[PDB]
């Protein structure tokens, strides 16, 4: 029954590699999308990405940075980040069985796990694969990695659910505080940028195509001629904790978070049915006695992937559109980082009250008439938002954040 | 407040294709331990595994197969198990938004990430890589796999965390009873078995290279002269329900969930400290008014694990040690698929009437003196049991079932 807020955040992504440059980023409609030499070369059609612009070169201590991979080392820097804004020191969240965290990424590490085979085919053998690749590929490195430096005693684990990986760690997260069982959880993710994982994509014709030449504009959510996503990487995490315990420690709440809808489609492996989204969005809004203002969507800027949401939009509001922008359009699609990093973004726009322009939308579809597609920076008092997350194989999840009065 | 109970399981191991073959081998201390020439032609030093022995070929539809690893393909056989053996019908647990699924495993697939990666740089390219990489080796292909040809609605994602992985699974589902969000959650994990991922654990020293000529001798959990864990694969799942539903639909009852516990060391990487296992054991035990009479032990048979884990059992239990064995002896370390094929194992000993032995113990390690490790199996009434999941980055979990009262 306890309450939950977001006391402290922090993010590595292609727009900024904190909250101060994705806030600049977000007001200007600011693309983070380049184009990618190693894509190019590695055969791939797709070669445009949201990279991180940061040499994480000596930012992590030598005896910790070796067991990890670049998510992991992505949601290390960000949790660094979201320690520092919570205000927390080590004496409150170390060696505390109250603290935990849940972080997962939605691929591990494909190029640490080619990396080990190709060792191992070498002359060499063993010896080139070495004892650090089983913490950087295996699937729990992002959680495993983050929560014995930081001296975590609580939960430790990773979740992953592709696109929508982040979401459901900070909506578990979540339940662990209502269930009594810890009193702050550091929550989040993060996803390494890499031809390795990238071609898996490009090879189910998922990537964008058609703008290699003009990369800031290949990421175009809702824009009649978009083609795909924009794959990329980096890193995100928000302190999720109780309200008394925030509150007892003079703590900074960012919102509250209000709904939290989790499910499934059953229907296609990669498509979108719509149907589960219309369920979860309805999920999240349990209870909740005020109108959403902004939704941050999930909208990755697919043919197919962008109208069923449109649809389902319409389905749950019909006339009460709230405004609606895709952040994607300015990032690309960083999979298992999006989640909280978009929950980062709807943050800073509850936070500072503006709403990021959905930029690159040269002719509407027709589909997304009559909604409330805001293009352009505007400013406007915020309360309520939320941010959509659906991920391949099915599985949906949103999160419903609103101030806490004052 | 709802209590949790356990009405259907599968299984597909290096012991049993099913619950019955299972049994068997478990009663007569059968060794599921066999020679790789898989492992000994990739260049290891270990050449041995627990494997799983069945051609899978055919058992699933071509259209849902198609997206699946070996990780998935266990997971889904053990589920249909799970479903006839709970009593389930289609009406009853498709397109029910009360019906969930939670199930990971440990490495998602290193051998479609390596398929992905050789494709792609051959003479092919992406046409060589194809389009169903993406669900093969994404993290949270096993529920992503499993959910959309079950017609699963409630919640779906995968829950990762090395060797505990498939514990948290389970544990996670009964939170989603216990918060009145699900009706019916089926949890629980599988892992392929691979050189891509075995040759990462053998190149940290990890596995068992002094009895490749035995096989059946390898894994020797508390024996003195143990030296790693036998690698193995397969799946396991089970149908977590809530009571009044499960009693409701006249459902069979193996046991109640009554305890479950989940910790973090926040201290080694890779090896266990011991004081996150006595905080683990203790969560569990909370509330839990009968003595444990028999304790399914994580024991791996490495030299230091087997030990911290004897030391934690010694801490909470004292002189009431519990009955104790370590079935990992007979079938070796399934990894992500260890948590729910261990806690299979226990539910088919407090279901019959016995406790399994704990094999090839030729000479008792000193600090297990005093203990009552049992070597030989014997026939018991159980009541409560209990079975222990530390993983790699120092997480863990521990689940206490007991019988319900007839």
């Known amino acids: 029954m306890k309450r939950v807020v977001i006391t402290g955040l922090g993010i590595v992504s292609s727009i900024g590699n904190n909250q101060q440059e994705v806030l600049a980023s977000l007001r200007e409609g600011r693309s983070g999308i380049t184009f990618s030499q190693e894509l190019k070369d590695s055969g791939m059609r797709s070669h445009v990405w949201g990279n991180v612009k940061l040499d994480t070169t000596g930012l992590i201590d030598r005896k910790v940075v070796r067991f990890?991979?670049?998510?992991?080392?992505?949601a290390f820097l960000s949790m660094e980040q979201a320690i520092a804004d919570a205000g927390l020191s080590p004496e409150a969240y170390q060696n505390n069985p109250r603290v935990g965290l849940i972080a997962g990424s939605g691929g591990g590490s494909p190029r640490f796990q080619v990396f080990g085979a190709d060792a191992m085919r070498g002359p060499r053998g063993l010896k080139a694969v070495g004892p650090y690749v089983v913490t950087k590929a295996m699937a729990s490195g992002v959680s495993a990695c983050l929560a014995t430096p930081?001296?975590?005693?609580?939960?430790?684990?990773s979740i992953s659910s592709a696109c929508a990986t982040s979401?459901?760690?900070?909506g578990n997260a979540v339940e662990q505080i209502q269930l009594g069982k810890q009193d702050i959880v550091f929550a989040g993710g993060g996803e390494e940028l890499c031809w390795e994982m990238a071609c898996e994509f490009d090879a189910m014709g998922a990537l964008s195509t058609k703008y290699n030449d003009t990369p800031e504009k290949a990421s175009r959510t809702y824009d009649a001629h978009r083609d795909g996503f924009v794959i990329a990487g980096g890193?995100?995490?928000?302190?999720?904790?109780?309200?008394?315990?925030?509150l007892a420690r003079g703590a900074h709440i960012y919102a509250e978070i209000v709904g939290y809808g989790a499910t499934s489609d059953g229907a296609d492996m990669v498509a979108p049915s719509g149907e589960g989204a219309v369920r979860c969005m309805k999920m999240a809004m349990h209870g909740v006695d005020t109108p959403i203002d902004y939704l941050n969507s999930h909208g990755t800027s697919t043919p197919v992937g962008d109208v069923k949401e449109l649809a389902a939009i319409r389905e749950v509001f019909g006339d009460k559109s709230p405004?609606?922008?895709?952040?994607?359009?300015?990032?690309?699609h960083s999979l298992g980082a999006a989640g909280v990093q978009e929950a980062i973004y709807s943050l800073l726009?509850?936070?500072?009250?503006?709403?990021?322009?959905?930029?690159?939308?040269?002719?509407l579809d027709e589909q997304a008439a009559g909604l409330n597609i805001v293009t352009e920076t505007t400013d406007r008092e915020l309360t309520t938002v939320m941010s959509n997350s659906f991920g391949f194989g099915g599985t949906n999840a949103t999160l419903v954040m609103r101030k806490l009065k004052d």
Chains 1, 2 share one sequence.
């Open 68 to 74: 990890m991979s670049d998510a992991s080392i992505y």
């Open 150 to 157: 930081f001296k975590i005693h609580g939960v430790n684990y």
């Open 167 to 170: 979401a459901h760690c900070i």
């Open 349 to 363: 726009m509850l936070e500072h009250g503006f709403i990021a322009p959905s930029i690159n939308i040269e002719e």
């Open 323 to 332: 405004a609606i922008s895709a952040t994607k359009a300015m990032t690309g």
């Open 235 to 246: 890193g995100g995490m928000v302190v999720v904790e109780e309200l008394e315990h925030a």
